[PDB]
Design a protein around this ligand. Structure first.
Ligand SMILES: *[C@H](CC(=O)O)[C@H](C)[C@@H](O)/C=C/C(=C\[C@H](C)C/C=C/C(C)=C/[C@@H](C)C(=O)[C@@H](C)[C@H](O)[C@@H](C)C/C(C)=C/C(=O)O)CC
Ligand SMILES: Nc1nc2c(ncn2[C@@H]2O[C@H](COP(=O)(O)OP(=O)(O)OP(=O)(O)O)[C@@H](O)[C@H]2O)c(=O)[nH]1
Ligand SMILES: [Mg+2]
Lengths: 1011, 175
């Protein structure tokens, strides 16, 4: 259990202590903790050593526990994967025979089904590796040998079925990225070429054998074969009939069988029409035996065991697959109406299963059917296919209305600081589920508005009587009601909403107590927000709704206020017009009333809700087009926050120490959040407010920054977790947010550059440089990035001084490993990308040593394992190569200085197993660069060798570079790869596959020819 | 009641967040930086359910090919598994079948959850409509976000149900 004992395991001067190897492996699996790491290091270290497999046999001969035998098998797999083409031929034959003999011996023992199945599987995988390495050429009779030996014994045949399945998986499913392209084509052609023999064996076992495990393994293999085999074996043999009759109905075989059928149903081919019909017919005739249509499949799944559940899901998959691909074939056969309906009935039953995955499988088909019927004809209460499906479309509509998922998703998420904000998750599986249910229901509502309205009226009647009254059920009904918004004509929509609102009002009046009234009040709020056309059509209705929301903003009950604010912002965005223009029966536009009453409306809201409110009002203000009226609206709009802001600025002028008061900093952060939301809504004209506070804001930023910095130097890193430092960092972040957010939406780069940028240089940038490393706010860099991206040229001239502040001192934070200060790395290369992409003359205008530093930083970027960092680094390098190619004068000097350097760095990354994610970029660059050398490059990279053209110098230089990088390569290999670099420099995916082939080659030794 | 522990094996492509996930479950900390796991680290997690506490010895493995170690081997004697990818890198999803293959070749029949991490990032690349691999492999899928706690415990909850056999188990987070 000691490091020395572990080190003994790898001496190579003495016999292996299989006793000790077992102890170390048992430490690997059951070793508790601190030596576990040791034991793993030692086992990996031995496994990767060059001697490797010399002991493999010893391990297998003498060891007592399974894990150690498995470890030896790992070593054997390593040798076969990498150094097989360099073993002497007799060694390969000995390993071949050792392996198939071990496979034989293991299966014969009864215990194999028992005990270590894992070990048998690993052995079969070893043999499949040997096959992948040399199956056609060096083992030409293999398929014949094992097909014949399978008719001798049945256990041998079952294990050989597993072997054939693994070979199919390795040749046809996972060949790309593990096997070179030509060898993949070769293995596929070789398996496809000798397949009829294998299929004979399978037909024989299926039709004749009564060994249940062997039959199961054969079916499992037939699955993977269905993935790739020619259609003749599937649709021109006994196969479909044999599956449906002999295996689909018997319990232990029903899953696999059905899976196979599903795969066969996935094939989309015009020539096997009848067969497909058969496949449906027969399959249905079996399902009605095993699963009578009267069955509560919801209960059957809810109570049932694992294979029952798997069969229900496989049934959903089969019916969805077949119907989507071949519903037309059964539609045009009258003698099959009843059967088709039955299948649909099945789906409906399966749709009641409370399992969101199975339900998504069903909703896939329901959306398909609704979309097909809508594309046939989009009009209401006759086309033929819809006439076929009419007896059950109402069942489908009831399903959608009755199981509607929640429309949007909110969650309380805590930021980098302590603040828990209410974040609406934007793009999730559940929201996509809602959108699919909505699409289906909207299709079917277009097919018949009356039927949808009737189902909803019945659900809501059941709400009113108390039969189906629950917070959950009312929520679901209202979600559906909102989901069909826009599906009906505006007149039908109005009549329908009038009834809905009236009945919901009556239901409210009926129930008593805050909890019931709260649930009903939101549902009403949600429904109203979901119908903006109705609101724009009726003015008083809308005014009264808005008046109530303002009322609800004082309800202390939880969620009433939140829903009030959410509905307010939805209505404000969707009806902004109606607040700025004077309405019929009104003396002044509503915005002026709201602005006169802000302080009355928001006194009881929590800060986040106030932010939401101000954003909602900002949309209205942005709707007003006359610049002067809009200015006055903005001034009254920001009255209340500006009051507290000016109070705090004045107190700070009198005494700065109030900027260390907790509640003062909390208020400053809240005010800045309010400004940020207002700016998002209002847009460019918000400048009038921004410029009003700008300088003041920058001032407080500076001060707070310094505070945090000093607070670090006094107490180190710990101090960054205290509430006060936390709220100060919040102020800094909201300041940067407001600045970059207004700049993002500013339509005057001239004014921005001359007015708003210069104060940043000393207030934030040199302040960033002056901060202690841990105090530097990464969000500085990113904000600058945004500014650059928006300013373009109007900011080129200022690139130097900015870089004086942020560049040098940021590099030294992120050039001593690849991991610390991640936010800074990301934002830094974002800023550098912005500069290179929009202000390239600045790179041309700096000293060459500094440009060398910039280029080095780019290279440093794409060496990252942080994918986004390396990705933006490659993008920078690519657009930089093009930008250099833009001007002929410095292009040749840049090439002479950096071309080979860039090439060797990129090659260091391309051959790295940790950067494959960037392949598409790598190719795109290399291709480009190599194309550049074919023509378009005039000067010579090497002053000493001018005879040689760049292609000749590049060819031999890169070949030398790879030969010295990977010494175990062949000269022919390297020459072929280097010439392929030039040959494929205008087919980027072919170039990519060339790189992937080479990346496979650099992982295994090769001897003499490819053979 | 009984301290009923199970071996979980956690796999997926590099920098997918497997380790960040386990960190937040173990100490509530959210690690901001990528520090590649070498070989595997086995951390125990303990949840408390309405029917007694449950213990997951999580074998957080290394997705980087460089540092795979005994990749194949760690899967031995495992009761359950999680396969993770990154909804912001299509590559990480295209490799889900490979992790699943190498996983079920060792432990042929165990409950496996498939997780799409980083669902908080607004520029999602692996579109939610496009995750369908788990269907025919009878795997359960979730949209966790290690930073937002979106469906934070749902994978462990689902696995605890599938291992204890009570389709109504619940985490209570008792002392
Ligand atoms: C609790 C009730 C209780 O406890 O008694 C609930 C939750 C209420 O507090 C919530 C009500 C909400 C909204 C109401 C619907 C807002 C009222 C609107 C209203 C009174 C509109 C007037 C102007 C109408 O004209 C009414 C009578 C008419 O029915 C409208 C709805 C339709 C129209 C305009 C008909 C037409 O043909 O033009 C919470 C948001
Ligand atoms: N936006 C976002 N980023 C995340 C989330 N989870 C993790 N990350 C980031 O992604 C990276 C995850 O790193 P790790 O958790 O160490 O990754 P890993 O899968 O353990 O890596 P290996 O062990 O090497 O395979 C870090 O940079 C995290 O900040 C998440 O839910 N959202
Ligand atoms: Mg890790």
């Amino acid at each position: 259990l000691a490091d020395h004992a572990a080190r003994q395991l790898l001496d190579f001067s003495q016999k292996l202590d299989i006793n000790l190897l077992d102890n170390v492996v048992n430490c690997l699996y059951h070793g508790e903790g601190a030596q576990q790491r040791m034991a793993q290091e030692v086992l990996t270290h031995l496994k990767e050593h060059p001697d490797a497999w010399t002991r493999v046999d010893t391990i297998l001969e003498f060891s007592q526990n399974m894990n150690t035998k498995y470890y030896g098998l790992q070593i054997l797999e390593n040798v076969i994967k990498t150094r097989w083409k360099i073993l002497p031929r007799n060694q390969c034959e000995g390993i071949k025979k050792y392996v198939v003999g071990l496979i034989i011996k293991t299966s014969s023992d009864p215990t194999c089904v028992e005990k270590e199945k894992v070990y048998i599987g690993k052995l079969n995988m070893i043999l499949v590796q040997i096959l992948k390495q040399e199956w056609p050429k060096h083992w030409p009779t293999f398929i014949s040998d094992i097909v014949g030996a399978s008719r001798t014994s049945e256990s041998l045949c079952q294990n050989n079925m597993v072997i054939l399945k693994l070979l199919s998986e390795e040749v046809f499913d996972f060949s790309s990225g593990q096997i070179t392209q030509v060898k993949s084509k070769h293995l596929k052609d070789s398996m496809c070429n000798e397949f009829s023999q294998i299929f004979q064996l399978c037909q024989f076992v299926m039709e004749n054998s009564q060994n249940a495990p062997l039959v199961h393994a054969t079916l499992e293999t037939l699955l993977r074969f269905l993935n790739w085999i020619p259609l003749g074996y599937i649709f021109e043999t006994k196969l479909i009939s044999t599956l449906i009759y002999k295996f689909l109905n018997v319990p232990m075989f029903r899953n696999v069988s059905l899976k196979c059928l599903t795969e066969i149903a996935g094939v989309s081919v015009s020539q096997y029409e009848e067969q497909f019909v058969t496949l449906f017919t027969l399959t249905m005739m079996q399902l009605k035996q095993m699963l009578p249509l009267n069955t509560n499949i919801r209960l059957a799944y809810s109570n049932g065991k694992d294979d029952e559940q798997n069969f229900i899901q496989n049934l959903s998959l089969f019916l969805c697959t077949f119907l989507k691909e071949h519903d037309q074939l059964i539609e045009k056969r009258l003698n099959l109406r009843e059967t088709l309906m039955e299948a649909l009935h099945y789906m409906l039953l399966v749709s009641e299963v409370e399992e969101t995955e199975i339900f998504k499988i069903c909703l896939e088909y329901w959306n398909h059917l609704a979309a097909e019927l809508y594309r046939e004809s989009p009009f209401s209460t006759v086309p033929p296919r819809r006439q076929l499906y009419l007896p059950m479309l109402f069942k489908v509509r009831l399903l959608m209305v009755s199981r509607m998922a929640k429309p949007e998703e909110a969650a309380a998420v805590e930021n980098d600081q302590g603040e828990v904000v209410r974040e609406f998750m934007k793009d999730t599986d559940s929201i996509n589920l809602y959108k699919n249910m909505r699409e289906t229901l909207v299709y079917l509502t277009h097919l018949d508005y009356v039927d949808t309205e009737r189902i909803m009226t019945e659900k809501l009647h059941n709400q009113v009587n108390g039969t189906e009254w629950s917070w959950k059920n009312l929520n679901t009904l209202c979600w559906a009601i909102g989901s069909i918004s826009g599906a009906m004509h505006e007149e039908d929509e109005k009549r329908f909403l009038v009834t809905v609102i009236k009945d919901l009002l009556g239901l409210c009046e009926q129930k008593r107590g805050k909890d019931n009234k709260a649930i009903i009040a939101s549902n009403i709020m949600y429904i109203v927000g979901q119908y903006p056309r109705f609101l724009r059509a009726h003015w008083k209705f809308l005014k009264t709704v808005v008046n109530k929301l303002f009322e609800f903003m004082h309800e202390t009950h939880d969620g009433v206020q939140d829903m009030a604010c959410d509905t307010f912002i939805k209505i404000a965005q969707k009806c902004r017009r109606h607040f700025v223009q004077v309405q019929v029966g009104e003396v002044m536009p509503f915005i002026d009333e709201i602005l006169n009453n802000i302080n009355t409306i928001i006194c009881d809201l929590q800060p986040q809700q106030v932010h939401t409110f101000y954003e909602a009002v900002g949309y209205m203000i942005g709707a007003q087009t006359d610049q002067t009226v809009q200015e006055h609206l903005i001034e009254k709009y920001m009255l209340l926050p500006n009051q507290v802001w000016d109070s705090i600025i004045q107190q700070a002028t009198k005494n700065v120490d109030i900027l260390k008061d907790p509640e003062t900093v909390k208020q400053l952060g809240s005010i800045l959040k309010t400004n940020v939301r207002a700016c998002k809504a209002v847009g460019h004209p918000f400048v009038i407010q921004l410029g009003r506070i700008y300088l003041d804001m920058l001032n407080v930023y500076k001060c707070l920054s310094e505070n945090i910095s000093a607070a670090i130097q006094a107490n180190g890193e710990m101090v960054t977790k205290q509430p006060l430092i936390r709220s100060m960092r919040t102020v800094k972040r909201e300041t940067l947010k407001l600045i970059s957010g207004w700049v993002s939406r500013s339509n005057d780069p001239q004014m921005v550059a001359e007015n708003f940028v210069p104060p940043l240089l000393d207030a934030v940038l040199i302040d960033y440089q002056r901060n202690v490393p841990a105090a530097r706010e990464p969000e500085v860099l990113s904000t600058m990035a945004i500014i650059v991206n928006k300013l373009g040229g109007h900011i080129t001239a200022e690139i130097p001084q900015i870089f004086d502040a942020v560049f040098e001192c940021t590099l030294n934070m992120i050039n001593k490993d690849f991991e610390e200060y991640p936010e800074h790395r990301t934002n830094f290369f974002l800023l550098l990308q912005a500069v290179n992409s929009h202000c390239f003359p600045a790179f041309l205008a700096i000293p060459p040593t500094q440009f060398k530093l910039v280029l080095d930083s780019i290279i440093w970027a794409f060496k990252h394992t942080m994918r986004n960092v390396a990705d933006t680094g490659l993008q920078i390098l690519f657009t930089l190569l093009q930008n250099v190619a833009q001007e002929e004068a410095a292009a040749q000097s840049f090439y002479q200085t950096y071309f080979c350097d860039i090439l060797q760095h990129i090659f260091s990354v391309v051959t790295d197993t940790s950067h494959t994610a960037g392949l598409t970029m790598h190719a795109s660059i290399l291709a480009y660069m190599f194309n550049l050398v074919e023509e378009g490059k005039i000067s010579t990279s090497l002053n000493p060798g001018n005879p040689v053209n760049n292609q000749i110098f590049l060819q031999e230089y890169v070949a030398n570079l790879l030969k010295s990088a990977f010494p175990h390569l062949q000269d022919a290999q390297v020459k072929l790869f280097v010439t392929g670099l030039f040959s494929l420099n205008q087919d980027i995916p072919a170039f990519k596959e060339h790189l992937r082939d080479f990346l496979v080659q650099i992982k295994e030794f090769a001897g003499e020819d490819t053979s | 009641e009984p301290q009923v522990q199970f071996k979980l094996v956690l796999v997926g492509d590099g920098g997918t967040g497997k380790t960040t996930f386990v960190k937040r479950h173990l100490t509530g900390e959210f690690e901001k930086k990528y520090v590649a796991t070498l070989g595997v680290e086995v951390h125990p997690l303990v949840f408390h359910t309405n029917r007694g506490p449950i213990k997951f010895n999580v074998w957080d493995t290394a997705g980087l090919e460089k540092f795979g170690g005994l990749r194949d081997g760690y899967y031995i004697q495992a009761q359950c598994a999680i396969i993770m990818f990154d909804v912001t890198s299509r590559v990480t999803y295209k490799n889900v079948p490979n992790w699943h293959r190498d996983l079920v070749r060792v432990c042929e029949n165990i409950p496996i959850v498939l997780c799409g991490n980083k669902v908080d990032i607004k520029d999602r690349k692996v579109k939610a409509k496009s995750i369908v691999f788990h269907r025919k492999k009878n795997l359960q899928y979730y949209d966790i976000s290690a930073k937002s706690n979106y469906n934070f415990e749902k994978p462990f909850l689902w696995l605890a149900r599938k291992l204890i056999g009570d389709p109504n188990l619940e985490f209570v987070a008792m002392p």
